[PDB]
Amino acid sequence: PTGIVLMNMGGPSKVEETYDFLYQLFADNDLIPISAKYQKTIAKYIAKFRTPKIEKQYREIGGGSPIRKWSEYQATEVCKILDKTCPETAPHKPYVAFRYAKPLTAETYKQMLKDGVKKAVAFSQYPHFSYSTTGSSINELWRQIKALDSERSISWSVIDRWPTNEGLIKAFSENITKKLQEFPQPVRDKVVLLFSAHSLPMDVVNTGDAYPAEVAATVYNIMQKLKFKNPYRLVWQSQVGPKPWLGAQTAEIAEFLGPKVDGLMFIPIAFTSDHIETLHEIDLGVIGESEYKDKFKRCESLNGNQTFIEGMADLVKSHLQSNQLYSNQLPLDFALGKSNDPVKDLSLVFGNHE
Amino acid sequence: RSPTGIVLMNMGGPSKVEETYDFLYQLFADNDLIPISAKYQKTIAKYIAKFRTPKIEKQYREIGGGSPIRKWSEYQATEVCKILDKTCPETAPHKPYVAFRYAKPLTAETYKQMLKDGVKKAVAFSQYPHFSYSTTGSSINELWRQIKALDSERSISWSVIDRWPTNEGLIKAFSENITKKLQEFPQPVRDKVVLLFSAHSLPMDVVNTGDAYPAEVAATVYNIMQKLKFKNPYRLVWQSQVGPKPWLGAQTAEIAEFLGPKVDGLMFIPIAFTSDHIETLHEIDLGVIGESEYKDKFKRCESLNGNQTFIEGMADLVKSHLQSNQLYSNQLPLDFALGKSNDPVKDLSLVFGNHE
């Protein structure tokens, strides 16, 4: 009866859910401000155009996005813990809802009502809030609530951010340390730790989006635990089109530093499991294509790390055990966020209302 | 016992309205950025200087005439050295010194005085908690040029405090100063006041250089909100952007007008500087606040300036640095491999330390 829904953009489970995923992606004006008036029309064009290259990438990494598997694993593992940790909230049923990928919020919501859920928690898998990710996903949830649950059957609450959750910080530091063990001792303290997070379009950044600064907070907290032993730097990956994106591209920095450093390590700072971003962009692109493939290494993604899973369960417990169906920052985010169809009152969306 | 020089550094500000021309000349004579030249800049620098002087003099005129930077810097330095005499006896006589990059006294001037004072050890204490190659990096490159010209036989052993984003006294002074300023807000609406940490912005081509500034400022903001238990909505925004070029966004002014109508309170916090200057006294007080129709619900946090808790923090920072035996943070060699300058330091280990 208690629904724990993990949420993120998603990824195509099979090589061809790609064109559908991509179309859904570019059709969302809340993600990348392409055209407030013709985003969808423009989207199917961009989708039909980018499908070949992307489709080939999912093939070069096994033939699909591992997101769904890892998300389902994490969700149920977190629920098993809450069952023993929060017996006060009876069984905790794991759910997964992706913004663009397969299990869409609409599908998932149907189930939840069919399974008779009364209390639910939208658990954003992005530790750092961005209107483009969590915001978009919340605007979707609102649409679903209205169309699927008019009688306001389910009572929702949202975990909208957690940049410095203990398990998260502790899991990343442990993984960073053991990965450093692969470098030769006399050079270990010199390896540069490049925290690579998905970039953001300057248009979003300039709305005063919360994302940039929150990633920075996670990074610094990790370096404190590591006692600032190594040189570090927060850089950004991805980026699409001519429009400008954020501060120093992971790709350019790596190439520029290659000749100067004893080594480099990439850290998937903004995500919780493996996906096309790490398995391809980083592994086959940045690393497996550089002449320095040797002095280049990547920190393990969180995936099924138990410190991390325990940190998430703890994160949830603190959430359930309190008021606030959302953080103090959310109302400000929606005040600054840009959308054709936004949630006007966060207070009407999350709560009893029955 | 020979004196240990504690040197506070920062870009600077014209002490009095007449300094404006010299300040602006130096600024436009720097080609570590600004122009390219060497032979035809001792010229253009003075042309762009005379061209700007009027505007800038009117600004300082609007703030009581002159920048308060030198005043606060010399004071802070003196207060810090007085504590250090008691706290760090083996470096016994600690002498106050300031060295500005464009304002008086320039690096060369202060260096001459230190050499004539018989200083053996010196600490280049950057006043910026957040390192930027365009600021703390600029000072370090000038220091190097001066060391080579005014002290080729290096009688002085330098070390540098290049950053301190989460020093305890810093985070505590900002907390307290923010709570204090929040209390002069209604009460039924005090928790809803939005805290806008406002820092000097950076051009996008400097940010895309991999510069450290943006992330470190964010580190200070998160730590302050932690102390304050996230009771209030907040956001890190940027100011002072000028020119046709693209700057790091979330424009303070721009965002203040946007939120004005929909919020019942807004506070601006001088998150990246340590005392009053043109940015807070003029840009914010007279611009953002002063000319807005929401002046009433807009307030600015008090600058650290002479804050005692903040001074004690700087003392701890200096004590730790002196007793760590490190000549600079582990980050500095990365900043220099990423920075862009026409005359940079090639070896940081040759710049700092004993070279008898």
Q: Residue B194 in 3-state DSSP?
A: strand
Query: Which residue in B119, B214, B105 sits closest to B165, CA to CA?
Result: B214
B347 near A CB under 8 A: no
* CATH architecture of the domain covering A1-162+302-354: 3-Layer(aba) Sandwich (3.40)
Task: Determine whether B206 is exposed, middle or buried from the number of CB atoms within 10 Å of its CB (0-12, 13-18, 19+).
Answer: buried
What is the Cα–Cα distance from A152 to A145, expressed in whole angstroms?
7
In which residue are the tokens 């464009």 written?
Answer: B102
Nearest CA in chain B to A222: B219
CA distances from B309 to A301, B312, B314 (A): 41, 5, 9
Q: Which two tokens stand for residue A7?
A: 């949420």
Query: Which residue in A269, A249, A265 sits closest to A299, CA to CA?
Result: A265
- Cβ neighbors of B247 (< 8 A, separation 6 or more) are B201, B202, B203, B204, B238, B241
From B316, B335, B343, B347, active-site residue: B316
- Residue B15 CB neighbour total at 10 angstroms: 21
How remote is the C-alpha of A160 from its chain's centroid?
11
Of the candidate CATH numbers 3.40.50.970, 3.40.50.1400, 1.10.150.20, 3.30.230.10, the domain formed by B1-164+304-356 belongs to 3.40.50.1400
A322 near B CB under 8 A: no
Do B1-164+304-356 and B165-303 agree at the fold level? yes
Q: Which two tokens stand for residue B91?
A: 């470096």
Q: Do B329 and A208 touch (CB under 8 A)?
A: no
Experimental method: X-ray
Q: Are the C-beta atoms of B131 and B335 separated by less than 8 Å?
A: yes
What is the Cα–Cα distance from A179 to A298, expressed in whole angstroms?
8
Q: Residue B140 in 3-state DSSP?
A: helix
Angle between helices B308-324 and B168-183 (to 10 degrees): 170
Q: Are the C-beta atoms of B328 and B348 separated by less than 8 Å?
A: yes
Compute the nearest-CA separation of B2 from chain A (Å). Answer: 33
Q: Do B222 and A253 touch (CB under 8 A)?
A: no
What is the Cα–Cα distance from A350 to A5, expressed in whole angstroms?
14
- Which among A192, A217, A247 has the least Cβ separation from residue B334? A192
Cα Rg for chain A, rounded, in angstroms?
20
What is the Cα–Cα distance from A152 to A150, expressed in whole angstroms?
5
Nearest CA in chain A to B219: A217
Chain A residues whose beta carbon lies within 8 Å of the beta carbon of residue B331:
228, 231-232
Query: Which residue in A115, A105, A64, A91 sits closest to A275, CA to CA?
Result: A64
CA atoms within 13 A on the CB side of A306: 2
What is the Cα–Cα distance from B259 to B182, expressed in whole angstroms?
18
A91 near B CB under 8 A: no
- Cβ neighbors of A330 (< 8 A, separation 6 or more) are A158, A160, A346
Q: Choosing among B163, B202, B208, B217, which should be mutated to test the A contact, i.e. which has the most A CBs within 10 A? A: B208
Task: Determine whether A139 is exposed, middle or buried from the number of CB atoms within 10 Å of its CB (0-12, 13-18, 19+).
Answer: buried
- Cβ neighbors of B282 (< 8 A, separation 6 or more) are B59, B62, B63
Rounded (10°) CA dihedral B272, B274, B280, B281: -170
What is the Cα–Cα distance from A196 to A194, expressed in whole angstroms?
6
Q: Where are the beta strands (DSSP E) in chain B?
A: 4-10, 94-100, 121-126, 157-161, 194-200, 234-239, 266-269, 298-300
* Bridge partners, residue B157, by sequence: B121
In which residue are the tokens 């290259």 written?
Answer: A53
Q: For B285-334, give the DSSP string.
A: IIIIITT-TTGGGEEEPPP-TT-HHHHHHHHHHHHHHHHH--SS-TTHHH
What is the Cα–Cα distance from B57 to B15, expressed in whole angstroms?
11
How remote is the C-alpha of A267 from its chain's centroid?
14
What is the Cα–Cα distance from A46 to B121, expressed in whole angstroms?
62
What is the Cα–Cα distance from B243 to B203, expressed in whole angstroms?
9
What is the Cα–Cα distance from A95 to A182, expressed in whole angstroms?
37
Q: What are the strands of the beta sheet with A92-98, ordered from one edge?
A: A92-98, A2-8, A119-124, A155-159
A235 near B CB under 8 A: yes
- Cβ neighbors of A47 (< 8 A, separation 6 or more) are A19, A22, A23, A25, A26
Q: Residue A150 in 3-state DSSP?
A: coil
Task: Determine whether A97 is exposed, middle or buried from the number of CB atoms within 10 Å of its CB (0-12, 13-18, 19+).
Answer: buried
Q: Which two tokens stand for residue A3?
A: 């629904």
Does B264 participate in catalysis according to the annotation?
no
Q: Are the C-beta atoms of B234 and A331 separated by less than 8 Å?
A: no
Q: Are the C-beta atoms of B9 and B126 separated by less than 8 Å?
A: yes
Compute the nearest-CA separation of A236 from chain B (Å). Answer: 10
- Which among A217, A220, A235 has the least Cβ separation from residue B210? A235
Chain B residues whose beta carbon lies within 8 Å of the beta carbon of residue A332:
194, 233-235
Nearest CA in chain A to B260: A335
**H or E stretch including A191?**
none
Q: Are the C-beta atoms of A154 and A105 separated by less than 8 Å?
A: no
* CATH architecture of the domain covering A163-301: 3-Layer(aba) Sandwich (3.40)
Q: Where are the beta strands (DSSP E) in B63-156?
A: 94-100, 121-126
- Which among B209, B218, B231 has the least Cβ separation from residue A248? B209
Compute the nearest-CA separation of A217 from chain B (Å). Answer: 5
B221 near A CB under 8 A: yes
Q: Which two tokens stand for residue B211?
A: 């510069």
What is the Cα–Cα distance from B309 to A288, expressed in whole angstroms?
51
Chain B residues whose beta carbon lies within 8 Å of the beta carbon of residue A257:
337
Rounded (10°) CA dihedral B322, A228, A257, A241: -130
B232 near A CB under 8 A: yes
How remote is the C-alpha of A328 from its chain's centroid?
20
A337 near B CB under 8 A: no
How remote is the C-alpha of A126 from its chain's centroid?
4
CA atoms within 13 A on the CB side of B253: 18
What is the Cα–Cα distance from B106 to B26, expressed in whole angstroms?
9
Q: Choosing among B130, B168, B195, B222, which should be mutated to test the A contact, i.e. which has the most A CBs within 10 A? A: B222
Determine the topology of domain B165-303 in CATH: Rossmann fold (3.40.50)
Q: Are the C-beta atoms of A275 and A11 separated by less than 8 Å?
A: yes
CA atoms within 13 A on the CB side of B172: 11
From A149, A314, A333, A341, active-site residue: A314
Query: Which residue in B184, B204, B182 sits closest to B193, CA to CA?
Result: B182
User: What does the DSSP 8-state code read for residue B15?
Assistant: S
Q: Where are the domains positioned within chain B? A: 1-164+304-356, 165-303
Q: B105 preceded by cis ω (within 30°)?
A: yes
A239 near B CB under 8 A: no
What is the Cα–Cα distance from A306 to B268, expressed in whole angstroms?
41
Q: How many angstroms separate the first and last alpha carbons of chain A?
A: 17
The alpha helices in A61-103, defined as continuous H runs, are 67-85
